[PDB]
Amino acid sequence: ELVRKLIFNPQGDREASKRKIIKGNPTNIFELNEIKYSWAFDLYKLMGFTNFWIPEEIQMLEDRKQYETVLSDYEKRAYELVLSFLIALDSFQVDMLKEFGRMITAPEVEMAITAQEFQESVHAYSYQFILESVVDPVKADEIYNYWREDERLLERNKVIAELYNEFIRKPNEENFIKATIGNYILESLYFYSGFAFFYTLGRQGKMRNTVQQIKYINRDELCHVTLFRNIINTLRKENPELFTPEIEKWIVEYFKYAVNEEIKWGQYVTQNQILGINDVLIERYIKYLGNLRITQIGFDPIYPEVTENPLKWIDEFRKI
Amino acid sequence: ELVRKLIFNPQGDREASKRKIIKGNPTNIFELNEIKYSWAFDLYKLMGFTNFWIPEEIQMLEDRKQYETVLSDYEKRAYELVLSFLIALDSFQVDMLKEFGRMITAPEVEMAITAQEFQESVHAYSYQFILESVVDPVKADEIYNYWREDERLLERNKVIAELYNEFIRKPNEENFIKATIGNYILESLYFYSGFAFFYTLGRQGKMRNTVQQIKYINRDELCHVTLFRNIINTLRKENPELFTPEIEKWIVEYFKYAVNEEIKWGQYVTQNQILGINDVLIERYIKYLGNLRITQIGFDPIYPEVTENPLKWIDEFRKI
Ligand SMILES: [Fe+2]
Ligand SMILES: [Fe+2]
C-alpha cells in the first residue's frame, strides 16, 4: 500500500543521500543543490531544454496533396490506424505519468517525470496539428475515434489501460512495479510498428511532413525509455524484496506477449501491402527491440535467434 | 467524493460539447480536433511554446560580485528569505498540479495543467541555477533549508500545505474547490512581496541577473493565475451547487487572511531597511492585487479604500 507523500514534511531528511525512488522520507522541497540520481537531472535537462521542439514550426505544405492524390487505399488505412493508436498511447501517458510522479519520493526523478509528461502533451499537440494539416475535419474526427470502428484497436487500448488501472484501483507495491514495467514496454515497443511504417513511407518521399513530426516524437520516446530503464534498475537495487520470482517470471511473460502483440498490430496495419516493409521484417524488428530493452533491465535475450537490427537503416534515417 | 477517471473509458462521450472541468464522462483520449474550452488550449500554446525559456541561457556574471561586496546585511537576509520561500512554493506546485490534473475531465484543461506543472519545474531549475551562480555551496544548502532556521517561514510553508493536504487526505468536492481557490491565491499573492523586492533591488541596478530570472517566472505566474481564474469561473457555472454560501464566505475570509499574511511576510523580509520600498507601499500593493484577483472571480473588492496600484511602475519594469 504505497502512501502518497504529503505536500510538505518538516520531519523530512535534509541529506540528498537518503533519497529513495519510492518510500523515501523527503521534505518535498525540491532541494536540487544536491542530486543523488544524476541520470534523472541529466534527462530533465535533455527533455526539458535540449530537445524542446514546436510542432507548428514544422511546415505541412505537401502532405495534404500526397494524401489526396499519391497514397494507396492501403497507405491511407495504415496512416489512420497508426495515428489513431499513437494518439491513444500519448493520451494514456500524459495521464498515467501524473500517477508515477505523485508516488516518486526523489525530487530529481519527479522533475524528469514532469518533463516527460510535458513531452507527451507536446505529442498530443503534434497529432492534432498533423491531422488539421493533412485531412478533412470529419476524417480527423474519425481517426481520433477509430477504436469505435476497429475491434483490434479497441482491444489494444483496453489491454494498455488494464495494467495502469490496477495500480490506480489498488495502489500497492506489486501493482506499482507492474505499471512501471508496463510503461517501459509501451515506450520500448508500442510506437515501433508505427515509427517503422512512417520511415518506410518517408524513404520513398511519401508523407515527409508527417515523418518530420515523427522524428521529434521518436527522439522523445528514446529519452522516455532511458528514464524508465534507470527507474526500474534503481528500483531493483533499492527494493529487491519487490522483484519476487513471481514478478521476474511475469516481466519475461509480459515482454514476450507485448512483442508478439506489437508484431501482429504491425502486420494488421501493413498486411504486406506496404512497399519496402513486409510481415517478416516486422517480426525480427520487434524481437530485436524486445531483446535490447529486456536485456537493458537485467534479463537474458527473449529471442536468442535474433541478434541484428533488420532495419539498421532507421538508426540513421530518424536522426535530426 | 471525486473519483479519479480510469485510463480509458470506451463508454466515454464522443462530443467535445459534453466535456466538464470535473465529473465529465470523457474517453480520456485527448480528442483535440474539437475544443470546448478555447481559453485552456490558448494557455497551453502560450505556456508550452510561446513563453518557453531556458534559465541557463540567462548570463549570471555580475550577481556573485554584487552579492559578495555591494549588498547590505538586510539585502542579503531578504534575498535568502524570498528565494527560500519561492523554492518552497514552486516545489508544492509541481507536486499539487498532478492532483488537479488527474481529477480534471476536460483534456484541453488537463493539457494546460501539464504545461503549468512543467513551468513550475523550470522555476525549480532556475532557483538551483541562481544559487549555484550567486552563493557558496553551504549558503545555497542553507537557503534551501532556511525554514529549519526561521519560524515565520516554517509556518508559511505548513499553512500552504494544510489546504492542499486536506483535498489529498479527503478528496471530496468541497476540499477540491478549497484547494483550487488556495492554488489561485498562492499564484495571485504569495509571489508578490518577493517579486516587488527583486524589482526594487533591480531598479537600483542590484542583482539584475537574479532579476532577469524573476521576470520569466513572473510572466509564467500571470498565465497560471489566468488559467485558475478561468477554471474557478467555469466551475461556478458548471457546478453551482458547490459554491454554497458557506464556501462563498470562506473564499472572502481566506483571501483577506492571505492578503494580510503576504503583507506581514513582505514587512518581515524588508523591515523598512530596503531602499525604495517601505511597509506601507507593501500593504497597498498586496491589497491592490487582492482586490484585482477576487473581483476577477466574481466577488466585490475586499479593500474598497484601495483603487490604484501603488507600484504601477512594475507593470513596465517586469516586461521582456
Ligand atoms: Fe513517451
Ligand atoms: Fe505558478
Residue numbers in the entry:
A (entry chain A), B (entry chain A): 8 to 229, 576 to 673
Describing publication, verbatim:
pmcThe enzyme ribonucleotide reductase (RNR) synthesizes the deoxyribonucleotides needed for DNA synthesis from their corresponding ribonucleotide precursors. Class I RNRs are composed of two proteins, a large α-subunit (R1) and a smaller β-subunit (R2) that exist as homodimers, that combine to form an active heterotetramer. Aquifex aeolicus is a hyperthermophilic bacterium with an unusual RNR encoding a 346-residue intein in the DNA sequence encoding its R2 subunit. We present the first structures of the A. aeolicus R1 and R2 (AaR1 and AaR2, respectively) proteins as well as the biophysical and biochemical characterization of active and inactive A. aeolicus RNR.
We expressed, purified, and determined the X-ray crystal structures of two AaR2 proteins: one in which the DNA sequence of the expressed protein lacked the intein (AaR2) and a second in which the nascent protein still included the intein sequence (AaR2_genomic). We crystallized the mature AaR2 and AaR2_genomic proteins and determined the X-ray crystal structures to resolutions of 1.73 and 2.10 Å, respectively. Superposition of AaR2 with AaR2_genomic shows the overall structures are virtually identical, with a low RMSD value of 0.15 Å. Analysis of the AaR2 di-iron site showed clear electron density for only one iron atom (termed Fe1), which was built in with an occupancy of 0.9. Fe1 is coordinated by three carboxylates (Glu127, Glu194, and Glu228), a histidine residue (His231), and one ordered water molecule. Interestingly, residues Glu127 and Glu194 display alternate conformations. Comparison of the AaR2 di-iron site with that of AaR2_genomic shows that the iron-coordinating residues occupy identical positions, with the exception of residues Glu194 and Glu127, which display alternate conformations in the AaR2 structure. However, it was evident that the presence of the intein in the construct seemed to influence the occupancy of the iron, particularly the Fe2 site, which had 25% occupancy in the AaR2_genomic structure but was empty in AaR2. The low tyrosyl radical content of AaR2 (0.05 Y•/AaR2) is likely the result of the low occupancy of iron in the active site.
